Nucleic acid binder design. Sequence first.
RNA 1: UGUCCUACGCCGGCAGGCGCGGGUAACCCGUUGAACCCCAUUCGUGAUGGGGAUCGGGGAUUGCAAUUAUUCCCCAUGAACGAGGAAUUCCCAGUAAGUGCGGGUCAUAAGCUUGCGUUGAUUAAGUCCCUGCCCUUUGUACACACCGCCUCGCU
Lengths: 118, 226, 58
Amino acid sequence: MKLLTHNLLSSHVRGVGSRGFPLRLQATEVRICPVEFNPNFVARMIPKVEWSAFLEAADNLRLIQVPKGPVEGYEENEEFLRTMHHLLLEVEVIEGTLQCPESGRMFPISRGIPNMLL
Amino acid sequence: ELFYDETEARKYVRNSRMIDIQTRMAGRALELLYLPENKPCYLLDIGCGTGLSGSYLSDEGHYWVGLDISPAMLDEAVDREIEGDLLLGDMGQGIPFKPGTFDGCISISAVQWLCNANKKSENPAKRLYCFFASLFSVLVRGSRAVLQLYPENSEQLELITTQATKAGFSGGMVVDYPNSAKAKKFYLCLFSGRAWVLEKKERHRRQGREVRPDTQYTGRKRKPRF
Amino acid sequence: RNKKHQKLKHQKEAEEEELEIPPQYQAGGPGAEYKAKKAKGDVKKKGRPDPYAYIPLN
RNA sequence: UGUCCUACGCCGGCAGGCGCGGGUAACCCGUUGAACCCCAUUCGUGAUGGGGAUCGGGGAUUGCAAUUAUUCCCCAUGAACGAGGAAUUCCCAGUAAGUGCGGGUCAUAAGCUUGCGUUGAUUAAGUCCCUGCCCUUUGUACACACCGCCUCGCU
């Protein structure tokens, strides 16, 4: 699972809508899968990222070393964009669980696909 | 979902004509939504299956998330080493993403499936309305969605169009090769926004009286009148 | 026989859409130029793009 | 069903060769010694002694001619195949299904259609929900029609 995917994920339950976000995380197997680095995608879609949800998600995944503020620019800072590319698009949660904050239902990330069945 | 076990997934990966045609409507579908060039957008793949359309989206540089209910489709998609992310779920229960998430939506042969009532608890119209409302929710405002189908009659078409226009989507559908049979595809494209004397001679004919023959010079000015 | 079947099923789809329209207005708010006369098929036109038909939704 | 159906004897492990008789037929094949089924042995949850395709070699038969394998027999290999997602096909009693056997087409196929027998089931004595057909009423419903509402900016 890409970090951005759960960072945009919600809960499909009728009652919790549309406040089922953000999902709480758990990981027991973390891998790195290379992805082509297009800086236009990152530069455009950082403003789409909810930063408090990103910080609490990283805290759920034991990880702290992220920039704390919205990194907006003209794709000139290679280090920040590269690190966030590694986190969002390359850090993969192969195995784990997702718990919903407003309902408690758990979805198993099982190599590497979470389930969304009733 | 129980069609696509290991055997039918092994059939699906081993089908040259099927792979070629899924690539063809994947290309046509990506052409049909007017996403800007040189802007890598964020897309929702519906009916990804083995990720053939997802592989085409990853080939063009776009990033995508696939949604499906069969485990063997997602397993063979992982075995094909796709670049996008997969999610195991049904569209009829709702797509679980925040509002303002997907820059575009591509559904490939996945929308004719919800048109019939298979279980007693199931209901085609309400499931289709929930699917279209969840599409309108998870899509970013101003995005576009292309939905490919092969309607077997017009009942599926009228149900799909009513549930699409009731959930707030605006647009239509375009048919590729409507007059053909092998190339006819349906793409529902939606987004979040002298005569007088002739009549008198006929009147005299219905009154049953004798009339002159009707010829070229019936209504014709004889000469200027001063 | 099959040509009449095609014509009647196309007419049935068109009439079903045209009867779908009035309740869509109430409760809520095709390739004619691409016909080939000589035989069944689809011939390219120069003035217009590749053959298609757009029926907008209400 | 039969002047190609074959009984019997010899040979070859088999496809198949040789000889001698019956049958123009409830007379001979034929007391039609069939297959499912029963009994006994082995295998043991294993893409496996399941399943058979695709291959290599050899032999024989039918034919003027078998090469792109006419057909069969024996040996060597055991691919996919794990009960199959959304169109539906047929069916109420000796019926479906399993199982074999004949006629027509045929110098030789085995694959189509017709029937025949053996073992033999589940549900129901209901309905117009869908499809198709046949009736009665109607031109009340929708649509057409009524009426209303029906482009701007200088000289």
